[PDB]
Design a protein around this ligand. Structure first.
Ligand SMILES: CC[C@H]1OC(=O)[C@H](C)[C@@H](O[C@H]2C[C@@](C)(OC)[C@@H](O)[C@H](C)O2)[C@H](C)[C@@H](O[C@@H]2O[C@H](C)C[C@H](N(C)C)[C@H]2O)[C@](C)(O)C[C@@H](C)CN(C)[C@H](C)[C@@H](O)[C@]1(C)O
Ligand SMILES: [Cl-]
Ligand SMILES: [Cl-]
Ligand SMILES: [Cl-]
Ligand SMILES: [Cl-]
Ligand SMILES: [Cl-]
Ligand SMILES: [Cl-]
Ligand SMILES: [Cl-]
Ligand SMILES: [K+]
Ligand SMILES: [Mg+2]
Ligand SMILES: [Mg+2]
Ligand SMILES: [Mg+2]
Ligand SMILES: [Mg+2]
Ligand SMILES: [Mg+2]
Ligand SMILES: [Mg+2]
Ligand SMILES: [Mg+2]
Ligand SMILES: [Mg+2]
Ligand SMILES: [Mg+2]
Ligand SMILES: [Mg+2]
Ligand SMILES: [Mg+2]
Ligand SMILES: [Mg+2]
Ligand SMILES: [Mg+2]
Ligand SMILES: [Mg+2]
Ligand SMILES: [Mg+2]
Ligand SMILES: [Mg+2]
Ligand SMILES: [Mg+2]
Ligand SMILES: [Mg+2]
Ligand code: NA
Ligand code: NA
Ligand code: NA
Ligand code: NA
Ligand code: NA
Ligand code: NA
Ligand code: NA
Ligand code: NA
Ligand code: NA
Ligand code: NA
Ligand code: NA
Ligand code: NA
Ligand code: NA
Ligand code: NA
Ligand code: NA
Ligand code: NA
Ligand code: NA
Ligand code: NA
Ligand SMILES: [Sr+2]
Ligand SMILES: [Sr+2]
Ligand SMILES: [Sr+2]
Ligand SMILES: [Sr+2]
Ligand SMILES: [Sr+2]
Ligand SMILES: [Sr+2]
Ligand SMILES: [Sr+2]
Ligand SMILES: [Sr+2]
Ligand SMILES: [Sr+2]
Ligand SMILES: [Sr+2]
Ligand SMILES: [Sr+2]
Ligand SMILES: [Sr+2]
Ligand SMILES: [Sr+2]
Ligand SMILES: [Sr+2]
Ligand SMILES: [Sr+2]
Ligand SMILES: [Sr+2]
Ligand SMILES: [Sr+2]
Ligand SMILES: [Sr+2]
Ligand SMILES: [Sr+2]
Ligand SMILES: [Sr+2]
Ligand SMILES: [Sr+2]
Ligand SMILES: [Sr+2]
Ligand SMILES: [Sr+2]
Ligand SMILES: [Sr+2]
Lengths: 142, 160, 337, 172, 132
RNA sequence: ACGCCACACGGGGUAAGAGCUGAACGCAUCUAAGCUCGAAACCCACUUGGAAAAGAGACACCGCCGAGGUCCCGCGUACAA
RNA sequence: CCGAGUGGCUUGCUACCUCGAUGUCGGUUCCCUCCAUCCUGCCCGUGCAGAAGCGGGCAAGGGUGAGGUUGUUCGCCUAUUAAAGGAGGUCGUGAGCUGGGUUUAGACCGUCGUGAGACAGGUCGGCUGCUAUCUACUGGGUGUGUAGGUGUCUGACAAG
RNA sequence: CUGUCCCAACGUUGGGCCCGGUGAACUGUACAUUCCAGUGCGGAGUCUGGAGACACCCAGGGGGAAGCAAAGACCCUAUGG
RNA sequence: AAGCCUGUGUACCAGGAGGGGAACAACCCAGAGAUAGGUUAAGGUCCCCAAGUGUGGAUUAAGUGUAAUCCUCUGAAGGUGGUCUCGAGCCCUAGACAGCCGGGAGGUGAGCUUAGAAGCAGCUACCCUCUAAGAAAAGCGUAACAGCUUACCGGCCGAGGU
């Protein structure tokens, strides 16, 4: 429900980790960031080992709890949180001025951050956040 | 007993039989095989098995490897084939075992081993160009019974 | 060597706490197949009796023979679908879009709701159809309520309100089907949805037992033999190993037992009638006399007499339906004796 | 490297992105040829498979794409056909095509019918104890044939004695 | 096994002493095991009307005593339910010795038998004098 | 409870494995790209909890001088307070 | 045969930790886990006709029970069973139980000792404390936050 | 012969729970909402990395604080008794 | 064998801060009065986190790896047409390597052994015609034949092959 984002990033075909790294840096510098088309963000590697890692994170836990997201929505949000001192005042403020979206709820098209784009014509070993979420059991709402 | 117990050279040389008694006999049956009445120079091909790491090889291993190697040469060239093989090392190093805990631990005598430095020839066979691939096969079986990785090297021989 | 043994009780019905709504809330609905139709109904539990039936099952050696069967009698008077709520598909699941209400309200629906005085049915309806054109319309459901007043044995007059999904042919057709029902007055009956012989899933909030110990609540053993005289009779051995140094939520412990929601699957509807054929002499104990629209459910139903129970077409039936079973006898013998 | 495939006069091949479509009198076939740094394009009267890299892994796929395309050429003109023979010993096997799947009844006396769905626009024709699988897409046809033979697979008993089943008789 | 056509509350356990309702020479039988049965921790294995059980002979002729044989439970004191709802119970617990093929080892059966047992073991039933 | 009722099937993706098309290596090849299948196991299905999910939610109506709620009273389908 | 390893269940070694005290063995009860899989599912080979097997692969979802001797763990034995697998959690579990064994004070026997008395021999008898501060969890409330009320829902996650 | 057991149920009396009155003790370096791993004198609520965590209160059975209680009664040592 | 025992030389901890190493007596930098400015050391420069999403070039597809030292970071003997790079020998447009088509012929089914053995049970020998080739037969197959192919020669193809 409306988010005055100073910056709108398009994650489509972009390496999740590299985008996250830059989005963290900016939020800490006072920027309100909105990541768009999360379901289409991507992560390099052999799909089978990638999925195993995220599946293990879902299985992990106990009474204290280890709530790990399954939707591309939260996967990306959590990825960003891991690059912020979210338990400190300054850190929580930055993280909270960053939101991720499935698709693009804005009118503007997001911008592509430098060095984050992936060339499908040069890469075959990579996966889509959306593909991971479906594998994880998420309900494809996108 | 595992070789892990004696394969390394982590003890002084212990070979003086004038100060050591009750040393077990060697299990190595022969050091000169094939046609020992002939010379090594009477052959065109000479292949040696070279040890790649410095180690100690218990007489039990020498015999097992020497056996599995010469035993193959016999099966492929006959009990009198035209070849000759040599195990040049002898197990001089006496081995102990402490079989009272660590009190008066000096071990009792339990065996013998040969110290081989990396790059040395453990075995050296001499054959004819025909039986060159057979000696290479005997060695492959031999190095599967001694601690270190080895190289099968062709010294005198270029018919390739 | 310590024999194996399944744990005590299931870990799938927790946490075992007091239910939030005494009115059951289905968390799943039947699939869309036949013509459009309301996918549920409700009534009030009255009690039990038995009926003699003619073996229906075509694969039974007893097919065609007399067979005694336990039956729970549920009073199922007509209900009232008072509104049509529409859901829209969004990236965050389904969300209510709008609702279409009516004018005809039961004289006492205002005991639970703030009945509408000013509403625009067409404005809402329009928003729904525009949504359907856009292709963002999620399933369609009806706000429904009971008429306790029609059931003398139940003290309450305050109606119980639940939402029931409408499934059917095309969305356009079931949408229209819904609007029709509502507009009228919403009045519908068990007949309109179920037919004797079909399988229904019954939901309800079980009988309450307050706080109970591990033995009753989880089915753990009582202390045995000599152990039962030392000071411990109904207490488990330990709360866990040395490590982990915490008590896991999986160990059977004391607490609230009963008054939980339960959804009992594949309950066969033996008969849907009206009158007093099923009432027992002297009256159902702690309930009263049945003389009106009723339903006979094969076997047991969760909840105490007088509690609201909800019906739903079986979502996972095992057997094919054998409609209108022949009832040769319904016991009216007193339940006191 | 670069390889040029001259498309037959009978055929016309169009292509957008990583997808190539081949149409002929015998039908059409569309495929995805996606591999790092290999560009597949339709240059007028020829299909071009090229890449700036020449490592073993790249050469492997290039040679693979070629055959896939040549097979498509052959598929839309001459077509692809596999022949099969239904052999049985004691129990008369009933093989029929029903809808978009080939059904086999009474296999080894089984009461339950074994079946498999047909892939793509593949056509299965039965004439007595002879079956013929055909179509423009060698992928779909080849699988349908195989699936039929697999359909009578038996692991429980000695296959040397229980040899009933449908087998591939002719490969194109 | 074939359905009994009646619900049974096993009234016997491993170790129970019951009557041998035949003329084999065995008077008292001790239940040792229940064919096809698998219990659960601490549960004493149970047997009831209709079950085939392994047994040892506690009382009877010298030749029969101490022998480990198979048998079929024909009567039990604990009630059983029939399709029409009615419960049926007997005056005692009894079993009939049987061989590999389930044929009664003896020539005659003593006392009444339950009709449900007939369904399962025909040759046993076709030796019954009374079937209730 | 010793009594009675109810507790799937089916989809999706895989392992081992069976194969298809297929090159590196003109052949061959279940694999290197691609694909068809395939476990009581994985995901969905089903049951239970769940607006404190800090992005702290949605809908409808009622109401802001009055909607609604508490206390009070008679009681339990509830309950150690 | 010889050679290379993995585990940390046995045993041995060491003497790092605790002697102003971290309660023993076995059992029991209750919870979680590991896979080197006993059964069950899906497979491969066969000295695979079939049936019944033998061997191997994936696989830890579920199951792996009742009894006779013995304090026993272990193990032996019986009848059942699809099978009646093994192991970790302070050799899980005494602010939970038991107290049969080990290992106090009484006594006997054998062996040893001049003797007191001893035994890594046997045997009969021989005690089980505490009102929970914190934390943990099972269930139940009161408040604050979200920011007037009633009713109906959504589903991030969570459990089977 | 029997609830010792299969396998537990219901009931009775006194407590327990709520209210009036009376009113201790054990224990207390400090801090303290923890959990999973790691590290560390090799057995951590406090160190490190993550995870989780709105506060307060009631009842409970005792997993942890190598829980509380007693300068170990085993073992060794003392130019001890 | 040990985070074992017992020597020796040395530096360190003990009794040594501060910087780095996630934490961490003795590993790295470093030996330190107070205060202040500056420049470096070890170590580090995608984020958490000060400084590069630095440059030229190559390799790796396993998340190998992102782990100086170590009780602490394992990974072995054995194996690998996974892939990259370098060397040597030989064959090749007088057409190589492979594949496909064609030919694979006669004396004679060699002699011997044998009831029989005719490439192919065993023993010995292993010769010459036609020719562009074709064994007294390399591997299956048959009771023995038959039959199916290897060698060998020719064609098709066309570039490296081994
Ligand atoms: C019945 C009441 C009595 O309570 C007992 O008898 C207990 C069951 C007793 O226990 C009895 C019985 C038994 C079987 O232990 C449960 C036995 O082994 C010990 C010696 O004595 C305790 C557990 C003993 O304390 C234990 O002393 C052992 C030597 C070490 C052990 N721990 C540290 C490993 C420790 O808990 C102790 C030595 O008695 C504790 C000491 C502080 C105080 N006692 C002297 C008091 C006055 C007690 O007499 C008592 C309260 O009046
Ligand atoms: Cl969790
Ligand atoms: Cl932080
Ligand atoms: Cl790639
Ligand atoms: Cl107990
Ligand atoms: Cl048994
Ligand atoms: Cl100094
Ligand atoms: Cl990873
Ligand atoms: K101590
Ligand atoms: Mg009654
Ligand atoms: Mg009666
Ligand atoms: Mg078989
Ligand atoms: Mg027991
Ligand atoms: Mg303690
Ligand atoms: Mg395994
Ligand atoms: Mg499990
Ligand atoms: Mg223990
Ligand atoms: Mg304890
Ligand atoms: Mg105690
Ligand atoms: Mg206590
Ligand atoms: Mg005793
Ligand atoms: Mg005693
Ligand atoms: Mg002391
Ligand atoms: Mg003493
Ligand atoms: Mg000091
Ligand atoms: Mg920075
Ligand atoms: Mg790694
Ligand atoms: Na990655
Ligand atoms: Na998780
Ligand atoms: Na000694
Ligand atoms: Na007590
Ligand atoms: Na303990
Ligand atoms: Na599946
Ligand atoms: Na080891
Ligand atoms: Na114990
Ligand atoms: Na399992
Ligand atoms: Na025993
Ligand atoms: Na302990
Ligand atoms: Na104990
Ligand atoms: Na005790
Ligand atoms: Na009792
Ligand atoms: Na505790
Ligand atoms: Na110093
Ligand atoms: Na540091
Ligand atoms: Na990794
Ligand atoms: Sr940055
Ligand atoms: Sr040494
Ligand atoms: Sr070796
Ligand atoms: Sr509901
Ligand atoms: Sr739900
Ligand atoms: Sr006691
Ligand atoms: Sr702990
Ligand atoms: Sr496969
Ligand atoms: Sr809220
Ligand atoms: Sr495994
Ligand atoms: Sr199996
Ligand atoms: Sr033990
Ligand atoms: Sr024993
Ligand atoms: Sr245990
Ligand atoms: Sr005792
Ligand atoms: Sr003893
Ligand atoms: Sr003694
Ligand atoms: Sr606040
Ligand atoms: Sr208490
Ligand atoms: Sr860079
Ligand atoms: Sr570079
Ligand atoms: Sr350590
Ligand atoms: Sr190392
Ligand atoms: Sr290696």
């Amino acid at each position: 429900a409306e988010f005055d984002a100073d910056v709108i990033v398009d994650a489509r075909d972009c390496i999740m980790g590299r985008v996250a790294s830059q989005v963290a840096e900016q939020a800490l510098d006072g920027e309100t960031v909105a990541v768009v088309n999360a379901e289409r963000a991507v992560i390099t590697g052999r799909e089978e080992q990638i999925v195993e890692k995220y599946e293990k994170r879902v299985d992990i836990g106990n009474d204290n709890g280890y709530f790990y997201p399954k939707r591309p929505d939260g996967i990306f949000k959590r990825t960003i949180r891991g690059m912020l001192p979210h338990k400190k005042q300054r850190g929580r403020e930055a993280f909270e001025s960053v939101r991720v979206y499935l698709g693009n709820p804005y009118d503007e098209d997001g911008e592509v951050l430098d060095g984050t784009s992936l060339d499908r014509l040069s890469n075959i070993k990579f996966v889509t956040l959306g593909e991971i979420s479906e594998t994880l059991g998420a309900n494809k709402t996108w | 007993k595992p070789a892990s117990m004696y394969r390394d050279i982590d003890k002084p040389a212990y070979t003086r039989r004038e100060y050591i008694t009750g040393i077990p006999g060697s299990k190595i049956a022969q050091h000169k095989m094939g046609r020992k009445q002939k010379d090594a120079d009477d052959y065109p091909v000479q292949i040696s098995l070279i040890v790649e790491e410095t180690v100690q090889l218990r007489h039990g291993s020498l015999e097992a490897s020497r056996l599995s190697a010469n035993r193959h040469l016999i099966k492929e060239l006959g009990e009198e084939g035209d070849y000759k093989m040599t195990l040049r090392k002898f197990p001089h190093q006496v081995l102990r075992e402490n079989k009272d805990g660590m009190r008066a631990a000096f071990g009792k005598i339990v065996g013998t081993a040969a110290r081989v430095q990396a790059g040395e020839q453990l075995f050296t066979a001499y054959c004819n160009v025909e039986d060159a691939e057979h000696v290479k096969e005997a060695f492959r079986r031999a190095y599967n019974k001694i601690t270190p990785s080895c190289r099968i090297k062709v010294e005198r021989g270029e018919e390739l | 060597p310590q024999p194996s043994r399944p744990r005590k009780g299931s870990l799938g019905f927790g946490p075992r706490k007091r239910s939030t709504s005494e009115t059951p809330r289905f968390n799943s609905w039947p699939s869309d197949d036949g013509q459009p139709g309301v996918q549920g109904f409700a009534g009030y539990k009255a009690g039990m009796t038995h009926v003699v039936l003619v073996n229906d099952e075509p694969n039974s050696p007893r097919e065609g023979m007399e067979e005694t069967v336990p039956v729970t009698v549920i009073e199922t008077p007509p209900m009232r679908a008072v509104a049509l709520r529409a859901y829209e598909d969004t990236p965050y699941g389904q969300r209510p879009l709008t609702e279409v209400w009516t004018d005809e309200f039961h004289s006492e629906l205002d005991r639970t709701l703030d009945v509408p005085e000013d509403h625009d049915p067409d404005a809402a309806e329009e928003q729904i159809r525009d949504a359907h054109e856009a292709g963002d319309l999620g399933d369609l459901r009806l706000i429904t309520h009971t008429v306790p007043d029609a059931v003398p044995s139940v003290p309450k007059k305050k109606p119980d309100v639940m939402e029931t999904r409408v499934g059917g042919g095309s969305v356009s057709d079931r949408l229209d089907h819904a609007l029709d029902i509502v507009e009228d007055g919403g009045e519908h009956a068990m007949n309109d949805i179920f037919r004797a012989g079909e399988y229904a899933d019954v939901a309800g909030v079980t009988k309450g037992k307050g706080t109970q110990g591990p033995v009753k609540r989880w089915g753990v053993q009582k202390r045995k033999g000599k152990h039962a005289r030392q000071g411990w009779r109904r207490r488990i051995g330990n709360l866990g190993p040395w490590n982990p140094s915490r008590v896991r939520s999986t160990v059977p412990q004391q607490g609230q037992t009963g008054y939980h929601q339960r959804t009992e699957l594949n309950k066969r509807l033996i008969d849907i009638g009206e009158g007093d054929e099923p009432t027992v002499d002297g009256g159902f104990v702690n309930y009263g006399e049945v003389d009106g629209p009723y339903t006979l459910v094969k076997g047991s139903v969760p909840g105490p007499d007088k509690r609201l129970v909800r019906f739903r077409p079986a979502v996972r039936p095992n057997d094919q339906p054998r409609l209108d079973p022949e009832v040769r006898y319904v016991s009216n013998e007193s339940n006191q004796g | 490297p670069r390889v040029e495939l001259e498309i037959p006069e009978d055929v016309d091949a169009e292509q957008d992105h990583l997808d190539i479509t081949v149409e002929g009198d015998n039908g059409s076939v569309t495929r995805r040829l996606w591999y790092p740094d290999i560009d597949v394009s339709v240059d007028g009267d020829t299909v071009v498979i090229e890449s700036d890299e020449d490592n073993a892994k790249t050469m492997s796929t290039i040679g693979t794409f070629q055959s896939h395309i040549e097979n498509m050429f052959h598929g839309v003109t001459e077509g692809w056909e596999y022949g099969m023979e239904v052999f049985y010993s004691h129990f008369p096997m009933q093989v029929n095509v029903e809808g978009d799947e080939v059904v086999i009844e009474n296999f080894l006396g089984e009461k339950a019918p074994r079946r498999t769905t047909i892939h793509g626009d593949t056509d299965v024709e039965i004439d007595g104890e002879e079956l013929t699988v055909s179509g423009p897409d060698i992928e779909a046809v080849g699988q349908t044939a195989a699936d039929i033979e697999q359909l009578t697979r038996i692991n429980d008993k000695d296959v040397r004695v229980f040899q009933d089943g449908v087998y591939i008789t002719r490969k194109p | 096994m074939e359905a009994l056509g009646a619900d049974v509350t096993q009234g016997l356990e491993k170790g129970s002493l019951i009557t041998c309702a035949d003329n084999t020479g065995a008077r008292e039988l001790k239940v040792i095991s229940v064919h096809g049965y698998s219990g659960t921790k601490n549960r004493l294995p149970k047997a009831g009307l209709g079950d085939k059980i392994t047994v040892s002979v506690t009382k009877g002729t010298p030749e029969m005593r101490r022998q480990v044989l198979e048998a079929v439970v024909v009567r039990q004191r604990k009630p059983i339910r029939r399709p029409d709802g009615t419960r049926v119970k007997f005056e005692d617990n009894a079993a009939v010795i049987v061989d590999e093929n389930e044929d009664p080892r003896g020539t005659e059966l003593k006392g009444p038998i339950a009709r449900e047992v007939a369904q399962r073991f025909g040759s046993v039933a076709s030796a019954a004098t009374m079937i209730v």
